[PDB]
Design a protein around this ligand. Structure first.
Ligand code: AMP
Length: 417
């Protein structure tokens, strides 16, 4: 237990001067015609690259991936265009090699300005990175154990120190996540930040801990929900999910609202464990309902008691429930939010999800530690442009999830302390 955090990071890594550092970063960026159209992921690693740079480092070899070429070189997923971006961000020349491992790679690296930055090609072009892959005719194909081993040592031969700045992909145990067997393994500033806020919230958080979950499906969250019930104090279940709970628990006339057949079967277990673990469940007691799934459709409000008429569905929290939010949230000390409270992507049904954000942002300033990790949830924080108003918005893909699901994250375990 308590594996998260308490690891090793760039910060406080003595003897970096004149050393060759290998950095695993997240460069999976959206691109159109060799034109990167969102350089945040690139700018984000600058702090790490900069620090290493002004510390000595004979070389700065960067390795990463983009897309899912599946083990075969696919020109639609080459990191070349990213190397160009870095030239302008660093203000100096950057070396691009169309390879990750090999003799030439090692040679070309050593033959490059003394404080140069070098960026190899997509690691995912080697089936040995993920382990499996597919072929030309699109058929599943598995790597060769000897090959994977060869690939992992070839990477380990690239440098002396290894810094991993790629959270969000640490839940998978790929060659670049657990293969670089070097002695010094530390987190990048990005990584370090993530590992910091999560443990600060899953290991020993300032109570009460609030978990805000949301989303249509309840069936694909059983694991998440349970693993949390035994560590949180309050929990708000919203968005679609609520309907399934409200029918199983209160015999509410859900109308046409979304109903999760599979999940309807785990509602008993949850409510039970929740009571056993002494966790308070908070569910909407009124909802805005539409006579058709689409923004701008006749809409009215009803209570859970009144119930939703036939051929009518609910699409957002009613005002009584959105007022009921203030107390639960503003009184929390730490908050893990994952899930919009309604169909936010449609203006008319985003009030419940927008008002929650303000309350989350506001409790942050009141001093509470707030973490978001949804992505679909973040996309809301992003559209609102409030990333900074929140303690930490995890840029973690599936990774964030599994850690909130209780899973282990190889990528992290393979780090020093
Ligand atoms: N009441 C609702 N009805 C339909 N979709 C919803 C509702 N509340 C939220 N959603 C969105 O529908 C999607 C359901 O996916 P998931 O959360 O993965 O089950 C998420 O991207 C939610 O933002």
């Amino acid at each position: 237990h308590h594996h998260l955090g308490n690891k090793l990071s760039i910060s406080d890594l003595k003897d970096i001067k004149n050393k060759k550092v290998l950095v695993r970063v997240d460069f999976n960026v959206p691109i159109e015609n060799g034109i990167i159209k969102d350089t945040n992921r690139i700018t984000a690693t600058l702090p790490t690259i900069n620090h290493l740079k002004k510390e000595g480092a004979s070389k700065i070899i960067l390795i990463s991936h983009c897309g899912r070429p599946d083990g075969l070189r696919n020109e639609k997923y080459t990191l070349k265009p990213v190397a160009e971006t870095l030239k302008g961000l660093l203000g100096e020349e950057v070396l691009f090699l169309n390879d990750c491992v090999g003799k030439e790679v090692e040679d070309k690296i050593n033959a490059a300005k003394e404080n140069s930055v070098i960026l190899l090609e997509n690691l995912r072009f080697h089936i040995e990175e993920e382990g499996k892959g597919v072929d030309a005719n699109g058929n599943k194909v598995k790597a060769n154990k000897e090959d994977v081993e060869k690939f992992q040592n070839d990477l380990t031969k690239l440098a002396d120190v290894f810094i991993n700045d790629a959270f969000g992909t640490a839940h998978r145990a790929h060659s670049s996540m657990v293969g670089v067997k070097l002695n010094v393994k530390a987190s990048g500033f990005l990584m370090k930040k993530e590992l910091e806020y999560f443990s600060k919230a899953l290991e020993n958080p300032q109570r009460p801990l609030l978990a805000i979950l949301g989303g249509a499906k309840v069936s694909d969250k059983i694991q998440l929900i349970k693993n949390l019930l035994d560590k949180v104090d309050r929990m708000i279940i919203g968005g679609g999910m609520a309907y399934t709970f409200k029918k199983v628990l209160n015999n509410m006339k859900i109308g046409t609202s979304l109903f999760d057949e599979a999940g309807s079967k785990i509602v008993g277990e949850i409510m039970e464990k929740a009571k056993a673990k002494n966790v308070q469940i908070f569910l909407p007691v009124d909802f805005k309902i539409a006579d058709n799934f689409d923004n701008n459709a006749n809409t009215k409000f009803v209570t859970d008691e009144e119930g939703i008429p036939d051929n009518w569905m609910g699409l957002d929290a009613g005002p009584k429930s959105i007022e009921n939010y203030k107390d639960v949230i503003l009184t929390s000390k730490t908050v893990i939010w994952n899930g919009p409270q309604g169909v936010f992507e449609m203006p008319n049904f985003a009030k419940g999800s927008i008002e929650c954000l303000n309350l989350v942002v506001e409790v942050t300033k009141k001093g509470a530690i707030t973490i978001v990790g949804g992505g679909d949830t973040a996309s809301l924080v992003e559209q609102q442009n409030k990333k900074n108003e929140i303690s930490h918005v995890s840029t973690g893909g599936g990774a964030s999830l599994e850690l909130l699901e209780g899973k282990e994250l190889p990528g992290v375990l393979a780090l020093s302390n």
